[PDB]
C-alpha cells in the first residue's frame, strides 16, 4: 500500500496471510472456515497441502501470541476467471477443521468480516519499486470511484469488465501495490478484493478491485 | 536483471551474496578476504556481526555443496560517499579469518575477480515491478556507454558525477534492476558496481555503475 499508514493492532482482524513456497498474498476471513482471496493468487494451482493460512497477524511472517496458523482443505477458483483479463478474479479457501470441528477461534484479533469511507490494507510494496514487503500491516483510505470514471478512455478504458470496481484517487498517491493481491477493501463490509492495477499511485490509474457484491450468490453457494 | 539469462553454474565464481536481517545485496570477491560492494547497501550502518557472506552460490539463499558461508570482520564505506547523489558509491568488506588464517577457500566455484563485451549479473528483479528476487543468478550482456552519452540531457544530464559510468542500451530492455545493488560488471576484470538507475530497462535510461578503475588507489590502500 503506497501512501498508507501503519494500522492498529486490532484494526483489521479479518485479514489473512497466505504462504506457499516463496509466494505470499493476503485474504479476508468471511467465515470461521472460509477465506476469500484473489483467483490470480492461486492461478498456478499449488497443492492445498502446500498452503499456510495465518490469522490474527500484524507483522508479516512474524509469530505473535494472537496469531493462528491453519491448513487449507481445498480452494475453489472462480470457474470463469480469466488470467488474461483478471475478470472474476476471486477464489475461496476452505480451512482445515481440528478434532472438534473448529477452524478459526474467534478472538479480539481474529474475526470474520461481513459481506454486503472505504479502507484498503495489506503487506505489499510501500513504494512503487520497493525491494521488500511491508513489515507492518499498512492501511489507507481510498474513495469509491464511479464506473463511468472507471471506463473513461484516460483512466482505464475498456479494461474495466463487469465485476470490477475502482478505488483511490485520480491524482495518484494513495493506492494498492505489488504484494497486496487478494487483500480486503472494507467500506464494516467487504466491498472489494485487491485484484490488479497499472502502476502504484499513478495519476488517472487507480487500483482495480473485485466487486464483492457482484459475486454474492457465488460465495453463498460455494461456502455452504 | 531485466532482459537477462540464467547463468551457468561456474560462470561467476566471484559474485558474493550479503545477508543481514531481511536485507540482501550482491558483491564481488576481489581477494580471498575482500568483497567489494556498494556503499548504499550499508548506508544504514548495520553491525559487522549481523552480516553474512555466502560465496560460490547459484540459487539465492539456498544451500549448496560449493557454497561458502563467512562472517564479516569489518566494512569500510567510502569516506566521500554521498547518500544524496550516490557518488563514491562503493564499500569494502573484510572477511573473518579462521584458525589457520584462511578467509575464502579457492575452488572452481569460488574465485576472486581481477581489477583493472561487458556482462552484468545479480539476483535482482527480473521485471520492473517484480514481487520477488530472482531465484537463479541472472546474467546479461550490456555495452559500455560513453560519458558524453551519459551526461546527455535526454539520458541522465547532470546526475552523472565523476566516478560513475553507464552500461546498457538507450532503447531499454536489458538492464539492472532493484535487488542487484553492489553486483559486478565484468568486461575478465571488474569494471563496475551496480549503483543506481531511474527505472529498469527504460528508453534513454541505462543503468549507472561505479567506475572501479576510478577508485583503484582507494581499493589498493584499504585492502592492505
Amino acid at each position, epitope marked *: 500500500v503506497v501512501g498508507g499508514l501503519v494500522a492498529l493492532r486490532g484494526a483489521h482482524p479479518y485479514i489473512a496471510a497466505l504462504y506457499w513456497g516463496h509466494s505470499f498474498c493476503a485474504g479476508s476471513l468471511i467465515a470461521p472456515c472460509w477465506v476469500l482471496t484473489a483467483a*490470480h493468487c492461486l*492461478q*498456478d*494451482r499449488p497443492a492445498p497441502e502446500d498452503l499456510t493460512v495465518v490469522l490474527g497477524q500484524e507483522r508479516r511472517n512474524h509469530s505473535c501470541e494472537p496469531c493462528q496458523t491453519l491448513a487449507v482443505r481445498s480452494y475453489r*477458483l472462480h470457474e*470463469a*476467471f*480469466s*488470467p*488474461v*483479463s*483478471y*475478470q472474476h478474479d476471486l477464489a475461496l479457501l476452505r480451512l482445515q477443521e481440528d478434532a472438534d470441528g473448529s477452524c478459526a477461534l474467534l478472538s479480539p484479533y481474529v474475526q470474520p468480516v461481513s459481506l454486503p469511507l472505504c479502507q484498503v490494507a495489506g503487506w*505489499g510494496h510501500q513504494f512503487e519499486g520497493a525491494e521488500e514487503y511491508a513489515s507492518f500491516l499498512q492501511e489507507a483510505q481510498v474513495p469509491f470511484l464511479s464506473l463511468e470514471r472507471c471506463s473513461a478512455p484516460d483512466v482505464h*478504458g*475498456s*479494461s474495466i*469488465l463487469p465485476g470490477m470496481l475502482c478505488a483511490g484517487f485520480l491524482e495518484g498517491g494513495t493506492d*494498492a*501495490c*505489488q*504484494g*497486496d*493481491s487478494g487483500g480486503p477493501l472494507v467500506c464494516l463490509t467487504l466491498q472489494g478484493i*485487491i*485484484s*490488479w*492495477g*497499472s*502502476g*502504484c499511485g499513478d495519476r488517472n490509474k487507480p487500483g482495480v478491485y473485485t466487486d464483492v457484491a457482484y459475486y454474492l450468490a457465488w460465495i453463498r453457494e460455494h461456502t455452504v | 536483471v*531485466v532482459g537477462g*539469462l*540464467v547463468a551457468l553454474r561456474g560462470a561467476h565464481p566471484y559474485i558474493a551474496a550479503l545477508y543481514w536481517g531481511h536485507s540482501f545485496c550482491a558483491g564481488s570477491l576481489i581477494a580471498p578476504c575482500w568483497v567489494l560492494t556498494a556503499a548504499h547497501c550499508l548506508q544504514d550502518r548495520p553491525a559487522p556481526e549481523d552480516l553474512t557472506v555466502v560465496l560460490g552460490q547459484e540459487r539465492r539463499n539456498h544451500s549448496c555443496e560449493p557454497c561458502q558461508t563467512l562472517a564479516v570482520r569489518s566494512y569500510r564505506l567510502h569516506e566521500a560517499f554521498s547518500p544524496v547523489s550516490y557518488q563514491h558509491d562503493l564499500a569494502l568488506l573484510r572477511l573473518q579469518e579462521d584458525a589457520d588464517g584462511s578467509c575464502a577457500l579457492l575452488s572452481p566455484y569460488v574465485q576472486p575477480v581481477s581489477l583493472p563485451l561487458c556482462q552484468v549479473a545479480g539476483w535482482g528483479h*527480473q*521485471f*520492473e*515491478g517484480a*514481487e520477488e528476487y530472482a531465484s537463479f543468478l541472472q546474467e546479461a550482456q550490456v555495452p559500455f556507454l560513453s560519458l558524453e552519452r551519459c551526461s546527455a540531457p535526454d539520458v541522465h544530464g547532470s546526475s552523472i558525477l565523476p566516478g560513475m559510468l553507464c552500461a546498457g542500451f538507450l*532503447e*531499454g530492455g536489458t538492464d539492472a534492476c532493484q535487488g542487484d545493488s553492489g553486483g559486478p560488471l565484468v568486461c575478465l576484470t571488474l569494471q563496475g558496481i551496480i549503483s543506481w538507475g531511474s527505472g*529498469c*530497462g527504460d*528508453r534513454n535510461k541505462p543503468g549507472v555503475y561505479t567506475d572501479v578503475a576510478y577508485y583503484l588507489a582507494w581499493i589498493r590502500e584499504h585492502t592492505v
Partner: antibody
Amino acid sequence: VQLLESGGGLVQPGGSLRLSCAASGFTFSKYIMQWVRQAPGKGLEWVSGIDIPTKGTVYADSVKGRFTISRDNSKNTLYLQMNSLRAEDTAVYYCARALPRSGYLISPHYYYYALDVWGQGTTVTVSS
Amino acid sequence: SVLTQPPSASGTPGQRVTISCSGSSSNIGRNYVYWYQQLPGTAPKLLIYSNNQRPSGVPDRFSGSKSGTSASLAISGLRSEDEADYYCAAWDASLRGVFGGGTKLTVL
C-alpha cells in the same frame, strides 16, 4: 531471442509426425509456448498451448485427440506430436511465445498474452 | 469462438485505412484484443496488444481501439510497406487463443 522449427515434410494421410521448436536467447520457463498453423492461402489457426495458467494444456477442437504438445525445458525445446494426420492438416506450423500475467501490476514494458516472438515456420505436407 | 474480419481493404499512400474485427461476448467483449501483421513469406508480427498498446519498434501511426464486441485497427500515414495481412486475436473462455479471418490490405 530466436525460435527454430524443424520436423516438417511430406507425410501420407493417416501417418504421424513430430515437430520441434528450439528456443534461444530467453528463459524457456516463464513463457507460454504455442503452435499456430498457416494453411496455404488461408489465415492463422491456433493449435496448442502449454503451461497456460489455470490450465495444463489447451488444444484446438480440430486437433484434439490427435496432437500432443510437450516441453523439454532442459533442452529449451518444444514438441508437437501429430498423429492421424488427415488431408487438411497441411500448413506452415509456427512456434511462438507469450508472457503470462503474474500479479497485481501490469507494465507497458511486458507484453502479456501477446505473441511477440515467432519462429520461421516449418512446412508440413499431408498428401498421397 | 470466431472473429469476423473483412476479406480485404484498399488504400492510397498517405491515406488512412481502418481494419475492423467483429466478435462475440466470450472473446472480444470479455477479453483483450491483439493485432498481428504478416508480410508474404514471413512470420506474423505483433502490432497491438491490450486493445491499444504498441510494442516498441512499431510506429505510432498504428492505432487500435476496442468497443464492446467489436475492435478496429487504424493505419494513418499509410505507406507502401503496409501491404500485409492483418489478423485480430483474442482468447476464448477456455483460453485457447483465437484468430480472425485476416484482411488483405492493398496499397494502391
